[PDB]
Amino acid sequence: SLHMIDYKEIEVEEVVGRGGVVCKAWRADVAIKQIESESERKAFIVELRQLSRVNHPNIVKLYCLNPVCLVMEYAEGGSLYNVLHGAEPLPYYTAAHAMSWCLQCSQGVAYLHSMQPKALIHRDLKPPNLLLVAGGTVLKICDFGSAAWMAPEVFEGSNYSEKCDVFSWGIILWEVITRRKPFDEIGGPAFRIMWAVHNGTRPPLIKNLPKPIESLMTRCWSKDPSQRPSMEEIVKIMTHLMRYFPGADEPLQYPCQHSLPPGEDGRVEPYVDFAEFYRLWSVDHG
Numbered sequence: 001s002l003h004m005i006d007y008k009e010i011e012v013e014e015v016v017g018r019g020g021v022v023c024k025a026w027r028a029d030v031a032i033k034q035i036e037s038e039s040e041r042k043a044f045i046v047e048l049r050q051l052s053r054v055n056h057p058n059i060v061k062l063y064c065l066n067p068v069c070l071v072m073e074y075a076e077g078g079s080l081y082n083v084l085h086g087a088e089p090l091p092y093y094t095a096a097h098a099m100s101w102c103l104q105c106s107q108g109v110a111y112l113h114s115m116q117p118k119a120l121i122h123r124d125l126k127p128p129n130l131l132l133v134a135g136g137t138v139l140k141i142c143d144f145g146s147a148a149w150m151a152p153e154v155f156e157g158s159n160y161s162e163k164c165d166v167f168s169w170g171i172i173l174w175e176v177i178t179r180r181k182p183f184d185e186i187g188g189p190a191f192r193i194m195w196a197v198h199n200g201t202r203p204p205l206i207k208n209l210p211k212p213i214e215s216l217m218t219r220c221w222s223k224d225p226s227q228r229p230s231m232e233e234i235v236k237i238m239t240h241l242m243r244y245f246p247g248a249d250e251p252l253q254y255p256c257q258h259s260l261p262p263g264e265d266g267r268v269e270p271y272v273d274f275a276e277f278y279r280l281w282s283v284d285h286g
């Protein structure tokens, strides 16, 4: 379903980073990653079979076979990780942006869980794989250590299902609300986090978190994957909550010297402010 390109047609510009290697650059802006060594071919081709079927707003759009190369939509905004924890100066964002991002993420993952004949599992949902465009207001996923966002049945070898992507989304929800790195204090190598999560450890709960949001977030954290909601249920819930989070379309433009309080009492302070939420919620309820 794709569209070949002549390699001479592309004009390289700059380098971006490694997920292969991605480079900035066609027909008057695109992002491309050339393959390195034949070991990645057998995977590189799969991505092609997948992305060519995919067509969704919140998933990176896939626009050469000699040399093997991909030409994808360029995300001028960068990764969500760089927005939350990247280089100074960091941008200010609101509760509306946190919820909007997560919603758009669930929208894109639900489209994957609905593909026929078989569903597609991302299996590596984390902010570094979530790109932003339109002034940081639109989120797009790119399938192309993940211990913090990995469901406990995944790294235990148990035959997992798409519900592993739900667990990740739940962690991503806690990350944008607190603007913290999940299990940053644990540290050490990857296995020290797997042991913690495997034992039931989850991120600390959030002061003043709305019970509707605290409920959904933890339901996604449940050990039993069958007690986790489906993405379709997340999309629906998140869609209805956006009614209490206006201003998602406002771009990121203001800086933010952000102080990080330490995790005191196993209960952290959110970065976003839920004042406007409770206010709008009292209006409808009463």
Ligand SMILES: C=CC(=O)Nc1ccc(Oc2nc(Nc3ccc(N4CCN(C)CC4)cc3)nc3[nH]ccc23)cc1
Pocket: 016, 017, 018, 019, 022, 031, 060, 072, 073, 074, 075, 076, 077, 078, 079, 081, 082, 086, 087, 128, 129, 131, 142
């Ligand atoms: C810190 C984690 C991280 O950046 N991960 C990451 C993920 C993908 C990636 O490649 C892409 N980038 C982008 N946009 C983009 C991504 C990152 C960046 N920079 C900006 C400068 N610097 C802060 C590093 C990150 C600039 C633009 N669009 C893409 N479309 C298809 C692939 C692709 C490049 C990097």
